[PDB]
Amino acid sequence: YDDPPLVCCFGAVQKEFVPVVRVHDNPMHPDIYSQWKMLQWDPPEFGRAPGGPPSNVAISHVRLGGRAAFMGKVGGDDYGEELVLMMNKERVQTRGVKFDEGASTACTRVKIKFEDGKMKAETVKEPPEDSLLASELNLAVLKEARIFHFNSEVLTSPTMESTLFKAIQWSKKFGGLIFFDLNLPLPLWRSRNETRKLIKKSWDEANIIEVSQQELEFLLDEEYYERRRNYTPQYFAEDFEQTKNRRDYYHYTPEEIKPLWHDDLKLLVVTDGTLRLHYYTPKFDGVVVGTEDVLITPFTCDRTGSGDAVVAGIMRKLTTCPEMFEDQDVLERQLRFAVAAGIISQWTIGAVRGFPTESATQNLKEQVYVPSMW
């Protein structure tokens, strides 16, 4: 088996398509998209470091010096061929991609209904990205891959749910690690309990989990942490640093994380964009302090694909540094690499277009941090 160790990204291959969508209270002009860049340097909190499809993570991982394979299905039309060509030019392994000649890539058949006086839609025919069967899996890829990566978008499709669980069994049989990068799509933000029930099985099937701060707080309690953020003492601060009215970087205790912990979880990472990387392991926990600067390039900055770069950097360091799971100092040092990768990825328009290379990421990491933190 060649080096570096292979990773597998399972799910849909799409161009852009950030899944995490919520309501923002600061909209720009509905027509003048030249104003919408001001929401890139003053983003909604859930969109600070947005993730995307697993193909973004695969491309970013390959650009950071790793070897990746994509497992999914595309149609036999022009769009599927173009997506496969884009993944191939990025040196992502395509042997796990299954073609469907009778399906239209990234197209879903829906029926519009008017239940209870409101327009609604229901899926008639699923797209080929959500129509991968367990018999179409690539067993060589699942055998070679050391990390298995997927998003919660597949949980919105029953076919992909069954295929994902079969693939997880296959990967665990061969010794691979399961990376659950949540990336909650629009439907999965409706209420906490239904999402917890929907993601419980995949959550317990994962060794590595990455969630955003908003995702974790939604999964535990949104109102409690919103109230805790808004609290201000009436008379005097409890310490001087609380007098500065600095941005809140609250580090969740493992006791608060206890509902979401299970036995096979080796590492949980909570990302507040690139600013904070809260990590939790069975033995220890902590936070990696990062930064961001999209105002350095106000006319080319774009946060799309930043979380993909962070996750790809995490996987790149995990595949080559097994001591990350057991050493806290090594874990922080290697997570600074993912912080730098996420920082660079915010400087370009387009997720795939702006994915950094390993050389640039290491250069930025050494420039930003003091030499003792390398």
Partner 1 sequence: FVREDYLVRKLSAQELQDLVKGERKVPLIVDFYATWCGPCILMAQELEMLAVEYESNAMIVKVDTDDEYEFARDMQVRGLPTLFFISPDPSKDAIRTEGLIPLQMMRDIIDNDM
Partner 2 sequence: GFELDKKLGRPHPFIDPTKKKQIETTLTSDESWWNWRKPEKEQWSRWQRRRPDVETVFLKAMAE
Among the candidate windows 186-194, 218-226, 254-262, 323-331, which touches partner 1 by CB under 8 A? Answer: 186-194
Among the candidate windows 117-125, 236-244, 254-262, 281-289, which touches partner 1 by CB under 8 A? Answer: 117-125
Is 99 strand, coil or helix? strand
Residue 153 vs 332, nearer CB to partner 1: 153
Is 159 strand, coil or helix? helix
Among 3, 101, 102, 114, binds partner 1 (CB under 8 A): 114
The reply to whether 181 sits near partner 1 by the rule CB under 8 A is no
Q: What length is written for the chain?
A: 374
The reply to whether 101 sits near partner 1 by the rule CB under 8 A is no
Residue 121 vs 140, nearer CB to partner 1: 121
315 strand-pairing partners:
none
Is 351 strand, coil or helix? coil
* Residues 88/340, Cβ–Cβ less than 8 Å: no
Among 5, 11, 47, 128, binds partner 1 (CB under 8 A): 47
The site partner of 31 among partner 2, partner 1, none (C-beta below 5 to 8 Å per kind) is: partner 1
The reply to whether 67 sits near partner 1 by the rule CB under 8 A is no
* Residues 154/160, Cβ–Cβ less than 8 Å: yes
The reply to whether 112 sits near partner 1 by the rule CB under 8 A is yes
Among 41, 86, 99, 107, binds partner 1 (CB under 8 A): 107
Residues 132-171 within binding reach of partner 1 (CB under 8 A): 153, 156
The strand order across the sheet containing 97-100 reads: 97-100, 67-75, 6-10, 147-151, 177-181, 208-212, 267-272, 276-280, 285-289
Rounded to a whole number, what is the largest CA-CA distance in the chain?
70
* Residues 146/316, Cβ–Cβ less than 8 Å: no
End-to-end CA distance of the chain: 30
Q: What is the dihedral of CA 233, 292, 12, 130, to 10 degrees?
A: 20
Q: How far is the CB of 234 from partner 1 (least distance, A)?
A: 35
* DSSP assignment letter at 49: S
* Residues 306/320, Cβ–Cβ less than 8 Å: no
Residue 30 vs 371, nearer CB to partner 2: 371
Residues 15-34 within binding reach of partner 1 (CB under 8 A): 15-31, 33
Residue 145 vs 364, nearer CB to partner 2: 364
Sign of the alpha-carbon dihedral angle for 81, 84, 90, 95: negative
Count of residues near partner 1 by CB under 8 A: 58
The site partner of 137 among partner 1, partner 2, none (C-beta below 5 to 8 Å per kind) is: none
Q: How far is the CB of 200 from partner 1 (least distance, A)?
A: 20
178 strand-pairing partners:
148
Q: How far is the CB of 295 from partner 2 (least distance, A)?
A: 18
The site partner of 366 among partner 2, partner 1, none (C-beta below 5 to 8 Å per kind) is: partner 2
148 strand-pairing partners:
8, 178
Among 85, 110, 139, 373, binds partner 1 (CB under 8 A): 110
Positions in the binding site for partner 2 (CB under 8 A): 366-367, 369-373
The site partner of 371 among partner 2, partner 1, none (C-beta below 5 to 8 Å per kind) is: partner 2
Residues 167-191 as b/e (b if ≥16 CB within 10 A, e otherwise) read bbebbbeeebbbbbbbbbbeebbee
Residue 79 vs 369, nearer CB to partner 2: 369
Residue 135 vs 367, nearer CB to partner 2: 367
The site partner of 257 among partner 1, partner 2, none (C-beta below 5 to 8 Å per kind) is: none
Residue 162 vs 300, nearer CB to partner 1: 300
Neighbours of 164 (CB within 10 A): 24
Residue 100 sits at φ, ψ, to 5 deg, of -125, 110
Which positions lie near partner 1, rule CB under 8 A? 14-31, 33, 35-37, 39-40, 43-44, 47, 50, 78-79, 82, 104, 106-112, 114, 118-124, 127, 153, 156, 185-187, 190, 302-304, 349
